[PDB]
Design a protein around this ligand. Sequence first.
Ligand SMILES: [Ca+2]
Length: 223
Amino acid sequence: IVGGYTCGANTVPYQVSLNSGYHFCGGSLINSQWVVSAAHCYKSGIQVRLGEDNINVVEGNEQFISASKSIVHPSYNSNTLNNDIMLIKLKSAASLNSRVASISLPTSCASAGTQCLISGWGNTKSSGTSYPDVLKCLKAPILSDSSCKSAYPGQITSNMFCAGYLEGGKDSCQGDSGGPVVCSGKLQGIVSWGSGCAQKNKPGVYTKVCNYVSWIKQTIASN
Ligand SMILES: [Ca+2]
């Protein structure tokens, strides 16, 4: 997260770290057995780490659980990043408590101007690299579709939205991918792609989760 702030331990209780011997993507817990993340975060040998704040230190409240299956959206396109969403079923159910809790799926898409909280352990520098130990947070608004399509002409499908600041300086970045964009207590976006990080006129692009709620429900129901 570039230009964000330290969330504070366990203030984002639905945030997941996907780990393969190191943190490579975020995710969001949506019930005790399932995580939503980005399809491009797919790999085998994923351990889902719940209740994390400092990802390099065991501090208490962590639950490490293996992924028993990861379901990339059947229509995910790696060149366009359209349908960049993946569901991970956990080998066993998480213990939900204060420190670990699920986030609700939306019933409606959020409108332009809705403020949202984006969180993750990704890079904090727009030029160079600096990975944080603790979870960073950023408040960012959903931008209008015409500003989004002006910023990224020909690349925004109906399954994507822009969120962030045209002035640059605050954004999600590498390592934040697959993590949550939560607006009004509902999971509205998944960190997907952008041009650089926190560059002027190049806001972040996010998977529009409200377009996938019946696919999520039907898939969880048959697996
Ligand atoms: Ca830890």
